[PDB]
């Protein structure tokens, strides 16, 4: 077994969406989705915290998530600048629970 | 920190779909979807370039992508022989933007 540096971050992305980011070996990141999304239009900037510098990718990464108890889907864009873009459908006032694992490289 | 070999491949898989493959440590591959898929029926071979030898898996890998601005989803199969099989719904003439991160092991 080989040992590698591990960093951890929780981001309140906005609109209810919670992100749990785990970065191993300063490269591979696995994002876990939590919370519930609401009141966000398609292609719009999410209204919360931007991803901290250590977790920022060199190029854009689209991460697929899933709405719990439904067959419907969503995805988000983590931009190199730190901002998160919502690329699911237009969600109204009713919050929908959001879950999923997505991985990306930083280097 | 541990440094590892990094190989890169872009694949114009066909039907508008674009693949960006990054292979680290000659094992872990993260595929990034791009482009817009159109004119493809379910289970059909995609009409473009196959995946090059250094990036082909030993066993079939199903990768899940998402349609931007929608709650609809898709997946592709990267076969050991390098071919790419479309496994989403049938898509007509109108192109839909395709995004998502998928990972697989080669060995």
């Amino acid at each position, epitope marked *: 077994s080989i040992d590698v540096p591990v960093q951890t971050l929780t981001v309140e992305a906005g609109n209810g969406l919670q992100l749990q980011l785990t970065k191993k070996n300063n490269d591979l990141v696995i994002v876990r989705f939590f919370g519930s999304v609401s009141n966000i239009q398609k*292609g719009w*900037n999410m209204s919360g915290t931007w991803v901290d510098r250590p977790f920022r990718p060199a190029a854009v990464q689209s991460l697929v998530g899933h709405f719990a108890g439904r067959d419907t889907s969503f995805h988000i864009d983590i931009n190199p600048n730190g901002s998160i*873009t919502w690329w699911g459908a237009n969600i109204d006032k009713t919050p929908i629970a959001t879950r999923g694992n997505g991985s990306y490289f930083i280097k | 920190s541990i440094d590892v070999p990094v190989q890169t491949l872009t694949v114009e898989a066909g039907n508008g779909l674009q693949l960006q493959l990054t292979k680290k440590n000659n094992d872990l591959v993260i595929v990034r979807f791009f482009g817009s898929v159109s004119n493809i029926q379910k289970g059909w071979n995609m009409s473009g370039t196959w995946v090059d030898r250094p990036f082909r898996p030993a066993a079939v890998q199903s990768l899940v992508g998402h349609f931007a601005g929608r709650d609809t989803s898709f997946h592709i199969d990267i076969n050991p022989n390098g071919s790419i099989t479309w496994w989403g719904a049938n898509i007509d003439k109108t192109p839909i933007a395709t995004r998502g991160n998928g990972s697989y092991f080669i060995k």
Partner: nanobody
Amino acid sequence: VQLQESGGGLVQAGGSLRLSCTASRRTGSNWCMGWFRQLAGKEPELVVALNFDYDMTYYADSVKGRFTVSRDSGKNTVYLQMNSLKPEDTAIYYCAARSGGFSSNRELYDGWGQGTQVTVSS
């Protein structure tokens, strides 16, 4: 120079007017260019925008179907074709570009044009 605005000016009722805005540099992914609408005394609002990476648009409820935004190719330019111009559409239209998607907030739009006066006569 971040942004370069052209076009605009004086126009008749129910007429048409075109607006152009090129960018010198891309700041990153989810590149978006569009226009803000500040009415005389009122609070400025995002009226129109386009994502270059995704080829998708946003329109405000008030201008839905009357206004059209498009690009060319490598030109890094967004074109705004305005039709059926009402006398309540008279404003100073500001060009704005950012990396990260559509935003209502004047916040961080890496490019912010000086603006162009648009007046509609009856």
